[model samples]
Target: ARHHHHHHMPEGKIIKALSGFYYVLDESEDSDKVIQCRGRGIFRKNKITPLVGDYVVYQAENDKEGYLMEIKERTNELIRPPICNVDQAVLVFSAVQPSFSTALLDRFLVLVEANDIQPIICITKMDLIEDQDTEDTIQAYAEDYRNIGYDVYLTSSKDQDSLADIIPHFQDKTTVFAGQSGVGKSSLLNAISPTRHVELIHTSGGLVADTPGFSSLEFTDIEEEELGYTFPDIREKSSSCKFRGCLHLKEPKCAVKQAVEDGELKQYRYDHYVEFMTEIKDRKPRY
Candidate 1:
């Protein structure tokens, strides 16, 4: 080992993790400096895998390379794309092209909530709506979700104004679009997870991720008791339930069920809750 050592070290986030290499970006406002570095062997010895989006302290050997010395704690992580510290999720669904379904919306909503990520609901292709009846229905659906406490946007890429508001949502945050499977373009940045940021590109100053929203829809990872919390409205209403721990199912004096009866909660929405609850309750043993 050499006795002489340089005092300067780079502390940055890993923007790209590829074949035995981690590309770190220096965000110190000095310059757009990137270091393609290898992780220290001790990381694997300790069972720590450096994912893209990880803030890490690294040592640079030269201009093009270095080694990851440490990784910071992640805010949240995704499975399919296998990224870390994602700030928010943009649940992008179509307005009329795919026959808009609230059930599907709730499906994405629950999962996003369960993952502890804030969601911005967006319905794209709004300009394609053909009839007033369908348009009214979509508007009504949007209102219901908005009432449930989420930023909902009906957008058409043709009308730039529609995106102006949506674009602001991405500022200074890492966002992933839920329609990543086959809707948007998939990049070569895989062997699974963490696309090289500079290459994948974005519309706003922030990152718009394109990993398959998720590989599957089943709430296999969630628990029955925990499902209610994922539905914000249900979680709020449950506090008023006479039963201390109500699953909002068959429990007398349940505020959640009462909300459905009083129309404060949409019927299909509650129905979706009950449906997901039942699915979770009935899950077969994994072992």
Candidate 2:
């Protein structure tokens, strides 16, 4: 058997993937430069498709082109927008326009947690809600999430102070903004920093993904056992359940269900958990 190897392989991060080419940012060069590259056919044989945030090993023919040789293991990955190795995710939602729905928020939260990524909840368009009752209702929801150990930030795109507070969370981490459509994700990004600047914007010593707008998300990849771990509150109490590997539903002496009935757990949160569990359990059989 003959072993083939490259004489000069440089390592870089893939900043963009477009039109069958990957634009990799090579920091090892004289100046940090981007090289247009294609992956080896071997990756295809291995059923691996390079994602935007992948750190890869490649051999460069010049500053302009290269062959992506290997993909480093990702800390986490998302198929919807095809990004990998994300440090954190910013789950953005609006208070009024789309009407705040804990169901939607829970979906995003579960997706982020299942991937082992920290989720920061950003509620936008606070200034639009004039009614004190509505504002109070939204504020209570925010507090509920915070009590559950999530960092929730309430903001208005129009308020510089609110936007300023959210920027610090992006520092030193690759953050992705996720939410439902029409949740003002674009508007919030523009208000955080100008939209014209290309490349990940450096904010408070952190980087926000230059590629924005991954509003929709799905939980198809998560398994039933994994889904329980996604909810921090549920995971904490699950250990005390009478049976090992408790699903926390209809089980005798289940700690989680006890918490729900005793008002220790929010009804909505537990409800959403059960709903998601059912969804995953009843998914169509695969080929």
Candidate 3:
């Protein structure tokens, strides 16, 4: 007869959260644990939504299913993929298939920078579209991000030998990879971590939700889930400023235009910012 041993359950950090359950990483013991934590009374008042990458304490129940008791504090968070406390966001884009677009990539950059998160640009699918003109075009596009201060990496899953470049980013820290549909996201996931299974899907275009108005408008009656926002003005402002990086276009002494006159920033960046702001200004709610 085999004998059983009684031991205390060890504490672990949650690597993933789905459907109100947390998956703790316990690789040191060569095992994984999913803890079923009750919606504690404290969480309701605090409105603490446990996100992925939250370190939590749990004890295994009688049935061996661990129940989370407490969650540790988070250092950071990102919206897409809903990962919390990550070091940087690894943005993946395709060079050929869906191709690269300034509007799309710039929007991604603005989101990352606005949230104060580090951005790592990862370009994929070089083998699929092999031509000097195409390569140069992609390079110039990447340069925009580089100029805006993001570490960029170019790779192809098909070129297995060159896959090592991306491995270093995934080590020792939680890094989120985000991009639009049909942009080789699944391919990069499979390439970087072969064991992980990812689904392949066809690309679709169009809007997901309608845009919302600025703070000056009365939105108290709007529901949280039904709400959206216009892209915030991101220009560097001058001496008479409410905050750093203000655009004095319509506002007072905007620092963004000052930077423009100083030639510290590209006019195209400011132009694009204005263009995006104008589109949002003209948009109506999608009700």
Ranking by lDDT: 2, 1, 3
Q: State every prediction's TM-score relative to the real structure.
A: 0.86, 0.81, 0.64
Clashing pairs in 2: 171-206, 172-206
What is the lDDT for 210 in model 3?
11
Query: Please, what are the lDDT tens digits per residue for candidate 2 over residues 133-223?
Result: 9999999999999999989989875773346666777665777777765554574466346433224444555556755434456667878
Model 1 ranges off by over 4 Å: 1-6, 41-44, 160-162, 180-203, 285-287
Which residue segments of model 2 deviate by more than 4 Å? 1-10, 27-31, 40-47, 59-64, 160-162, 191-207, 210-217, 284-287
In candidate 3, stretches whose alpha carbon ends up further than 4 angstroms from where it belongs are 1-10, 16-21, 27-49, 61-63, 76-82, 128-131, 160-162, 195-245, 250-255, 261-263, 279-287
Best by TM-score: 1
Ten residues in sequence with the least summed lDDT for candidate 3: 206-215
Candidate 3, residues 7-97: lDDT per residue as tens digits?
4545666654556656665534544434455435334455677665676666654555566656777776544445556555556677877
Model 2 / residue 22 / CA error / Å: 2.1
lDDT comparing candidate 1 with the true structure: 0.74
Q: Give one digit per residue, the lDDT tens place, for model 1 in 36-112.
A: 88897345565678887788888775344687777888888777777777778777677776778889889888998
lDDT of each: 0.74, 0.77, 0.53
Model 2 scores a C-alpha lDDT of 0.77
Candidate achieving higher lDDT, 1 or 2: 2
